[PDB]
Each structure stands twice: as C-alpha cells, then as structure tokens.
Amino acid sequence: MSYNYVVTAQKPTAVNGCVTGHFTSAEDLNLLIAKNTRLEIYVVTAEGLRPVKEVGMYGKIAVMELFRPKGESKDLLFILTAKYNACILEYKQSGESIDIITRAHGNVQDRIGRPSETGIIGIIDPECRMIGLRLYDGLFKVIPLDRDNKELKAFNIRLEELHVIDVKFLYGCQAPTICFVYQDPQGRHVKTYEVSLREKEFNKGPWKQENVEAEASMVIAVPEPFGGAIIIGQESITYHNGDKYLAIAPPIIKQSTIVCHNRVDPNGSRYLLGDMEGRLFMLLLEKEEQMDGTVTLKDLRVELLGETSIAECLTYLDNGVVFVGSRLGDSQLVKLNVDSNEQGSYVVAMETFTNLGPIVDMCVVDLERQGQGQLVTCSGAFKEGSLRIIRNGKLHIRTVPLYESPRKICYQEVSQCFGVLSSRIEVQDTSGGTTALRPSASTQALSSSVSSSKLFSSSTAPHETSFGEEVEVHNLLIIDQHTFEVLHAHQFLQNEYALSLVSCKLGKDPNTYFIVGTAMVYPEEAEPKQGRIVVFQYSDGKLQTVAEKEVKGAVYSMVEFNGKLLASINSTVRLYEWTTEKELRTECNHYNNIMALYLKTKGDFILVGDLMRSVLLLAYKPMEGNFEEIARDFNPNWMSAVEILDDDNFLGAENAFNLFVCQKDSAATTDEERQHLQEVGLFHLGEFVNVFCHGSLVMQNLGETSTPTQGSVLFGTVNGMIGLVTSLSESWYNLLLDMQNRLNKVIKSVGKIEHSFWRSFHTERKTEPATGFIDGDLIESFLDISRPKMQEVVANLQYDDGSGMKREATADDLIKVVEELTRIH
Amino acid sequence: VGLAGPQILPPCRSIVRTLHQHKLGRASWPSVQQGLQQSFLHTLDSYRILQKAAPFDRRATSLAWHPTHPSTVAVGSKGGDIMLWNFGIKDKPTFIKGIGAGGSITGLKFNPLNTNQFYASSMEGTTRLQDFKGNILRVFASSDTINIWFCSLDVSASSRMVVTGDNVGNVILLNMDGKELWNLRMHKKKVTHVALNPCCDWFLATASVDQTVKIWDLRQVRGKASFLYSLPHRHPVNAACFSPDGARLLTTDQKSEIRVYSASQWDCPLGLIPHPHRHFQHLTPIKAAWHPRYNLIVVGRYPDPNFKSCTPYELRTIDVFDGNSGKMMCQLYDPESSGISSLNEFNPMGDTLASAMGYHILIWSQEEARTRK
C-alpha cells in the first residue's frame, strides 16, 4: 500500500579513491576517480583534465587498481564493491562509442566472516600473478591471475595476526611477497610472508620481523632499485629491506596524522604525504651506490610543500601537477613549484572541484522568490567546512567558507537570518587556555557574546584538565540570509557541545527564539549525564539569554510541537511548555528508549528514531495530556535518520546503508498486533543518510493534478549525494517496476552485477530482495539508450495511457512518462 | 579479569561523540558498534533491579523467546509442562501440563510461521509440533521404544529444515512436513545440543558427551562420519551455539571452560574464557548464549572451590564477557535470587533478559523512570 520512488538529484561528489595509469590507450596518461558509485575517467593534458567517460556501477567501489598482465597492450582495471563483487574490466572505444568490457567477474563472498576494522583492503602483485584481499580478520584471500580465472576463483590463507593495519605486495621478489603491519598485545610490528600458490599458503618471508611505532599506520611498497618497504607512523618514518634499517623522527609531522601517500618518481625517489590539516609534504629518498650496481637507501628527508584541501588521496599527474581528492572538502588540481612564493609555500591551486560532502544538515528556503526553494546545507568539516546554497537552473552552488565545522542549521524568517551551530579545534596555548589553528567564523564575527550563563556553575564539581588535551569549541553563529556574513557568534561553555538547534515560536509568546540543546562532555563518562536547553532571542545583532533548563543528559534532538518544545534527552523524549514567565517546564515524558537521537512530528503524532530501538510511533493525547506508544518496529536497525512521509508511513535509514519503510499493521486483530510496525519497504541506497527534510527544488506547478508521484522529501549523504523520495500509487509502482525488470534484461551492467543484488537489502544479520522502491536512476536511464533498445524494453507491454483501457505501449509513451518523472528533481 | 565488579566500574572512554563522527564519515561503523556495546554494558549495570518473577512446578529445562514481540516468552519444564507468558498484559498467562514425571521437555523453539504454535522435544520420545491451547498438530518422528529419547532440537526457516538429537549418538533431520532423509548416527553417546547456522543454510553443528563437537554439511555428506570438521575437547560439552552473524561459534563444557572458535580454521581456537559452570545431575545444564547485536557473551556462574579463581569474591551471579577479547565486563547480582541461574537468554530485541533458575523465572529490565504530567 506504501509505494515509494527514489531518485538522485545530485550525484555524489566526494572522492573515495583515485589512481593514474594507462587505461584508455597505451600512449594516454589517464586519471581514474571513484565517487562511491561513479567511476570517472579523464585524460591528463598539459592544461588539465579532459573528461573521457563517466559510468555508474551497481555497487560501492571500495578498491580501484590498474594492472597490465603479460600479453596485454594496455592496463586492465580491477574493481571490488562493498558487497564483494569483484570484476576485471577493459576499456573499449570504437568511433565515438565507448564501452567498458567485462573481462572477468565473480562474487568472492565467503559464507562466514566478520568484516574487519580497517575495512576492505585490496592489492595486486607487481608481476600480475595474483590479487590479494583483506576482507575478514585472520584471513587473506588470493585470486590467482590465471587467464582462465574468469570467475575470479580464490582461496583463503590463515593469518595468525588477526588485527592487520596495512599490507602491500613487494616489488622485486622472485616469489609473490606481502609485507604488513599488525597489532598484538606486545605492540605494533612489521612482518612479511611469501605466497606459495602451489601450496595455497604463506611461506617465510625474506626479512625478519621488526618492532615499529605504536601508531604505525601505512605501508608503502617502494619499487626497484630501492625495493623494500616504508612504514609511516605518527612521529616517525622508517624503511626496511633485508638487513637495511633506516628511521627518522621529523618533528614537523607530529602535529597531524599522515593519512594518504602517492609516488612521484617511477623509480621511487620521491613521495607525497598528506595530513588531516591539509598539509602536503615531500618525502625524499637519497640513493647510495653499491659496487655490484645495486642501490641502497642513504637517507630519508621530509620537506613541507604547503597546504591543500584535507586529502583523502593524492595523485601526481605530470609536470608538477597533483590531484588532491578530498571527501571532507572540494577536490583540487594544484601545481608544485621548485621555488617558494612570498609566504614560503610551494603550492599553487590550479583548479577546484565542488564537494558538498559531508552534508550533516540542511533546510529548504524560498531564499530569493516565493515558490523557488533553495537548499542550504552545512557542508564540510574542519578548515574545509562551509555553507552551500543550491538552486536549480544544472545546479548553481554558492559557497560560504567558514573555516570550521558546521553541525546544524535552522532558518529564522522574522530575523532574516540563519542560526548555525559550529565547532572549531583548539590546542593548549603557551600559558593560558587554548588557541585556534587559524581564524574562522566563530573568531571573525562582527560581534560576539560569550555565555555568561551561570545556571549550574555553582554546586557543580569541575573536572580537571591535564597539559596536552586538545579541545573542541562550539559556537552558535547568526548569519545573514543575503550576504552570508557571520553577524554574531555565541561561544558556549568550556567542554559543552551543542547538538541540536531549532528556531520557533512557543506558547502564546509572540517572540521568536533560537533554542539549542547541549551536552556536558567529560572523558570518563560512557554517556553524558549533564546538559542544557537554552532559549535565546535575537535582537540588535546579538543573542540575549531568555531562559535555560538544566537536565541530566545529552539533548540530542529538539522539535517544535504545537507551540511546545519536544526534545530527546538520553533515553527519554520530553515535552516542555513555555510559561508566561518565560521558563521551560516539563510537560511530559516517555522512557522506553536506549538513546533517542532523532525526532520528527506531524500533527499530534511523533516519530522517534532510536539508537537501538530503531523506530517508535508515539501519539500525544490532548484530552489526557500524555503519550501512548502506538507502535514499534520490532526488527532491529541501527538508525541514522528518520522521516514522516504521511500519517501512515514512516521512513528510516540505517548504518548499513539501507532504507526502510514502516506502516501500521492493517491486519491486526489485537492491541498487541496493532503495536507492531511492519517494514513494508526495503531498499539498499548505497549511501549513509544523515538528514531528511520536506521540500523541493523544482518549481511547484500549482494545480498540476494527475502526476505520477506525490510528496517530496530531500535527503543528504556523507558522500554529498542528494536524493529525493516521493510517493507512488500502486499502478504506477507496478508499471515502473516491470519496466525495471525489462530494462534489467536490456541494460549492460558494468562488471556484470545484477541490479537486484545491488539494491537488495543487506545487513550483517539478514539478506532480502528489494520491495516497495523504484530505482528512479534506473528508470531515468531509459532515456539514454538507443531507440531499438527502448523498443525492446517496451516490447510486449500493456500500458494505460492517461485514463482508459489497456493497449500496446510504444517507446514514445514511455519516453513521455520518464520525462515527466525526471522533472520532479 | 578486573575492569568491573561489585566495586570496580564498567565504563571505559567517553567516545559517544563518535556518532557524529560517523555522521561525518571519518570513523568506521565497527568502532561505533564498539562504543554502543560499551553503552549497553553501562546501562546493564543498572539492570540490577529485578523487574519480575514467575513460578511454576518442579524444574526448568529450556527457554525460548517469542521472536517478534519483546515481552513474550516460552519455557519448558522437567515434567512436560509448558508455559507461555507475556509482560504488561496481566491476563494470567497460559499454561499446559503433561505427565509430570518422565516427560521432560528438553528443546523448544517457536514456530517461525504461526506464532500460536511451537515445536518441542520430549523425554517421551516424540519430537512434536503443538499448539499453546493443547492440541497436538503433528508428531514428526518417534522412538517407538521407551528408554531411548531425544535431547536436542533446532529448526531453520530460511532452509525449511528440522534437526533433532538422541540420547545414544544418532541425529535425525526432517523437513517441516516430514519426509525424513537422515537418522544416520553421528556420535557414540548422548547429543546435548545441536544447531543450524542462520547466515548460511547448510552447515550444521552438534555436540555430545563424547568430548567432541562436530560440524557437518547436511547436503554433501552422506557417509556416516564423512563429516566436515571435528573439534576435540578435554571434557564433555553442554552446548555449542552459533553467532547470528555466523562467523563465531561458541562452546561451553561441563567441567570448567568456554571456547571461542572462528570461521577461520575451525580446528584451532581464538580464545579460552575459563569460568565455572560445573555439571551435575539434578541441575539443569548451563547454556551460554550470544547477544544478537553485539560481541558479548552471557553465562551463569556456579562456584567451585577447586576452580582457580582470579577474582577473590565468588558469588552466585550472571557474568557478561566480551567475545573477541577474552576478559569480563560485567556481573549481575541480586539477593533474593541466590539460586543458580541455569539458563539465561537475551531478547532478539535487545532490551530484556530472562533467567531460568530452579523453580524460578526472572526478568531483569530497567525501571525507575521519571514521569509525565
């Protein structure tokens, strides 16, 4: 009875991986980029990047590596998805028709296994003898690269070391050899193993185990003539090869963790290093000659090159240019110069590529024109953090740099501004409190108002701070809707984090307030036990504290409720009334929760999203003044977000990247049965949803009756993808889903992955086919195939055109349908 | 050992911020699951207030949870007496009696299809499927000669199979409508427990008094101990229960031991959790259990003056360990319940625990909430 349609409005922008090689031709230098479902293929030019191809895969790319077996004139590509579909692909071009051929494909899922902590790791032997995968603890999977292994058949080897940090195949070994860093009760160590295919087992490696730094975190396989391996830690960089040992401890790198690396020279003489603060270093290997013609390592050196966006990955292209792929900020092309500029930097930005991710919160406002909705998102994190303003007409994006991490947003029409929760990092200063790493919005406001609140400053046991602890400083910014200048910044107390924010009227009071829920943070508490709700009023460019309410827990969420304030505190959902004397009074409470993170409301009904009790449907009783548990989803789901579609339909998203739709049990004959929500819809989105919100970007056609879908809920993701969910009738649902089946019979899936498998519900507990959800992206893909393929798709189809009786469907009819559908986003 | 006790504190680091870190995409899911496991342990040290108690006649032998609903549970006695009980209903729960002497129910799972049904294994020698109103729907198999009876039972719905164990050494495997192609012998003595994996469908586990626990492949093996794997022990085994995820097998002995075997190389173990659950005649044998959504273990303690205790205070209590580490994290205790918690089982839901002691049934939910207007 609930039928839903999901569609991409903006494809994901974050980069999960990027590599260089020769894929489109033996002569071309190509750049391959992964954005979570999309594979982008560019040619490197003297000026920049030429787009050659963009494809979608039915899967989340976790590994992306190029390789050239013997007999191949150019590189092949290995891809592995999050659902452990593996495929080897080849680029094919003929005229202007470009095809990626599937050379090999297979599912390498084992029956059993716990996925590891550091995630899927995938590497390929330099000699193209084998692929190695770290999927589960204690195991190393090997796909022998035989030409007949078109199914990618594999075997497992035991790893005695169960907690592997990183691993790489080595260069210059007569036998395939892996080197890896692992953790055990004695600390961190580095070790190697040879890989015997004959025995399908490890053999003793060429050099003995050595202890490494406690935070040894990355391995770099150095090519010949160097060979050996480099181990990157938090304070030191070491190199190991046989009897060769060389370690350095440059202080410059201790301030921030190195997180990605890339080789600059083919012989391994230089490497790039990227940290969490966006700093880019040059790592230099000094050669030492040997009388036998071999080369040993003489020295290691680190050189600060400059600052970039915070890099998930780096790739040297050519001519001193590097691509900086970020997930937390925009990606970039940067030029490295041999000589520094005035500020001592060797870095010059060449080009920037929009990244919306992470979208942690957003809202829709008719910023410019009534009925023209625009989406304002809190985007980015630390020095990359921004606001992003998005409108249709494909899309125009305005960027407001904040230089600090946003957390929440709301809009306040009557003040013509936005309230924005934000946070910055500070480190202990020379003599005093803490100091900021750079200027940012909370430190560059036109005016500021530190919290002079002393609600519980008295009779409150302070908790002590030792030298060395870094701090997060949270602020509420008030920002102009037109200029997006930081108008005001209110700094909260030491150690208190602001979590939720709403702007609303309350009770019979005509003033409009900004309301914030917070939590006291202390290092030893399994959960916060102290927090505040704080009601401010904005006037004269500042916030004045009108009221506070102390509570024993973290105010995770708040929502306006019929002029009252509903708020989630630790395992409770609490309603407060606004009295005439302007104070918060507890109206009512509900308790059957572990940790209530998310709330949404409609009418007198409340939908609660739980940390562990996935969803709960509550009702307020005006003639009784209390809550009743109406129903619950008794299937466990670790939620990340929830939404109300309507009075009868409840949407949820969970941490294993799926969506579900709950309803009341229509076929319930008892109050007990009536209390069971039924998960009637299931869909694997492939994204981590952080927020839903009602609204639309497409101009609304006032009085447009007889459309396919009804309602519109936008949602935002970690990868910066934005999508739209809308409602369907039963007949439309049937139509488009049959269309999906036949499209699946016609469409060529990259890597020979089935659409059904990809959208299939999937958690560590259960696997079930999709239901109740139309893959809108797949439907829109109808419009891009050739006409004969459309005719095949619509072959033997009974179709109800407009209102009437059934007849044979023609391609143009379905084109019309899908074109109307594309205009909802 | 350590890190929690009557005096020592449960809570480790205050990492809850990680949730928003997950909202940003930096930190990975397993760390979050770790932190929320930590959270559940912290609030579990406030499960201490025993919610409800329930008696009936002679002795408890088996326990089972209604899968869909939290507050409902089924329990099976020494005398073929079954009970079905729901909380927050107050409608004086439902009962069904049996012979009372030699009809000891020993296995009990709900019906995955018709919630008002249940499977059962009985000392009478009749693996049956029967209603909570009393009507027996179908017998499935039979001894056909007294003094030889069944002990173990389990079922799977995704594969539509039933499996049951005897008191001598042979296992039977039926379909949900009969159609028996099995009853080859697996062991030399009584089979105490047996179970199917939920995340695959077609490898099986059985445990016995033979000091051995065995992993089978019910479609591929037909050759009378042409098995897949066999793990030895120093003592007999009271129970072998799978994970929900399917990769961690748990095993629990009769003398003093718990073992964790993994997917990776069934033979060798990951870790030994020494802890006393000594076997005895009139006592109900002890059955470790997983918690469906974490890597925890829950067990009943039965002290032994001969067991080398690391902790100096040894009371009659319910212990809670970590799966993939080895040591402990919590201990539930409440006087007025100094009996020995033979059975303990968490809900599939995650908010409730049931304990079956001698002549007693206990419910351990939290309480003492704040109030509405």
Swiss-Prot record, chain A:
Post-translational modification: Phosphorylated by ABL1. Ubiquitinated by CUL4A. Subsequently degraded by ubiquitin-dependent proteolysis.
UniProt xrefs under SUPFAM superfamilies: WD40 repeat-like
Spans through the membrane: none
Disease linkage: White-Kernohan syndrome: An autosomal dominant disorder characterized by global developmental delay, variably impaired intellectual development, hypotonia, and characteristic facial features. Some patients may have genitourinary and skeletal abnormalities.
Region ranges (Interaction with CDT1 and CUL4A): 456-825
Modification N-acetylserine occurs at: S2
UniProt superkingdom: Eukaryota
Gene3D superfamilies reported in the protein's UniProt record: 1.10.150.910, YVTN repeat-like/Quinoprotein amine dehydrogenase
Protein name stated in the entry: DNA damage-binding protein 1
Protein's job: Protein, which is both involved in DNA repair and protein ubiquitination, as part of the UV-DDB complex and DCX (DDB1-CUL4-X-box) complexes, respectively. Core component of the UV-DDB complex (UV-damaged DNA-binding protein complex), a complex that recognizes UV-induced DNA damage and recruit proteins of the nucleotide excision repair pathway (the NER pathway) to initiate DNA repair. The UV-DDB complex preferentially binds to cyclobutane pyrimidine dimers (CPD), 6-4 photoproducts (6-4 PP), apurinic sites and short mismatches.
Record pathway: Protein modification; protein ubiquitination
Keyword annotations from UniProtKB, A to Z: Acetylation, Biological rhythms, Cytoplasm, Disease variant, DNA damage, DNA repair, DNA-binding, Host-virus interaction, Intellectual disability, Isopeptide bond, Nucleus, Phosphoprotein, Repeat, Ubl conjugation, Ubl conjugation pathway
Residues where Phosphothreonine is found: T810
GO biological process: apoptotic process; biological process involved in interaction with symbiont; cellular response to UV; DNA damage response; DNA repair; ectopic germ cell programmed cell death; epigenetic programming in the zygotic pronuclei; negative regulation of apoptotic process
Pfam families: Beta-prop_RSE1_1st, Beta-prop_RSE1_2nd, CPSF_A
Molecular-function annotations in GO: cullin family protein binding; damaged DNA binding; DNA binding; protein-containing complex binding; protein-macromolecule adaptor activity; ubiquitin ligase complex scaffold activity; WD40-repeat domain binding
Region of interest (WD repeat beta-propeller A), residue spans: 13-356
Record remark on domains: The core of the protein consists of three WD40 beta-propeller domains.
Organism: Homo sapiens
Curated annotation (Swiss-Prot), chain B:
Name of a matching Pfam family: WD40
Ranges that cross the membrane: none
Chain positions covered by the region annotation Photolesion recognition: 280-282
Region of interest called Required for interaction with DDB1, as start-end residue ranges on this chain: 14-25, 33-44
Keyword line: Acetylation, Chromosome, Disease variant, DNA damage, DNA repair, DNA-binding, Nucleus, Phosphoprotein, Repeat, Ubl conjugation, Ubl conjugation pathway, WD repeat, Xeroderma pigmentosum
Modified residues (N6-acetyllysine): K23
Effect of I215A: Impairs interaction with DDB1
Compartment list: Nucleus; Chromosome
WD repeats: 62-97, 105-140, 149-184, 190-233, 236-275, 289-332, 342-366
Expression by tissue: Ubiquitously expressed; with highest levels in corneal endothelium and lowest levels in brain. Isoform D1 is highly expressed in brain and heart. Isoform D2, isoform D3 and isoform D4 are weakly expressed.
Gene Ontology biological process terms in this record: cellular response to UV; DNA damage response; DNA repair; nucleotide-excision repair; protein autoubiquitination; protein polyubiquitination; pyrimidine dimer repair; response to UV
Posttranslational mods: Phosphorylation by ABL1 negatively regulate UV-DDB activity.
Keyword Nucleus: yes
PROSITE patterns: WD_REPEATS_1, WD_REPEATS_2, WD_REPEATS_REGION
UniProt GO MF annotations: damaged DNA binding; DNA binding; protein-containing complex binding
Effect of W216A: Impairs interaction with DDB1
UniProt entry tagged with the keyword Ubl conjugation: yes
Any GO CC annotation of this UniProt entry: chromatin
Its biological purpose: Protein, which is both involved in DNA repair and protein ubiquitination, as part of the UV-DDB complex and DCX (DDB1-CUL4-X-box) complexes, respectively. Core component of the UV-DDB complex (UV-damaged DNA-binding protein complex), a complex that recognizes UV-induced DNA damage and recruit proteins of the nucleotide excision repair pathway (the NER pathway) to initiate DNA repair. The UV-DDB complex preferentially binds to cyclobutane pyrimidine dimers (CPD), 6-4 photoproducts (6-4 PP), apurinic sites and short mismatches.
Family (UniProt): Belongs to the WD repeat DDB2/WDR76 family.
Entry's disease: Xeroderma pigmentosum complementation group E: An autosomal recessive pigmentary skin disorder characterized by solar hypersensitivity of the skin, high predisposition for developing cancers on areas exposed to sunlight and, in some cases, neurological abnormalities. The skin develops marked freckling and other pigmentation abnormalities. XP-E patients show a mild phenotype with minimal or no neurologic features.
Free-text note on domains in this protein's UniProt record: The DWD box is required for interaction with DDB1. Interblade loops of the WD repeat region mediate most of the interaction with DNA. A hairpin between blades 5 and 6 inserts into DNA minor groove and mediates recognition of lesions and separation of the damaged and undamaged strands.
Name recorded for this polypeptide: DNA damage-binding protein 2
Encoding gene, per UniProt annotation: DDB2
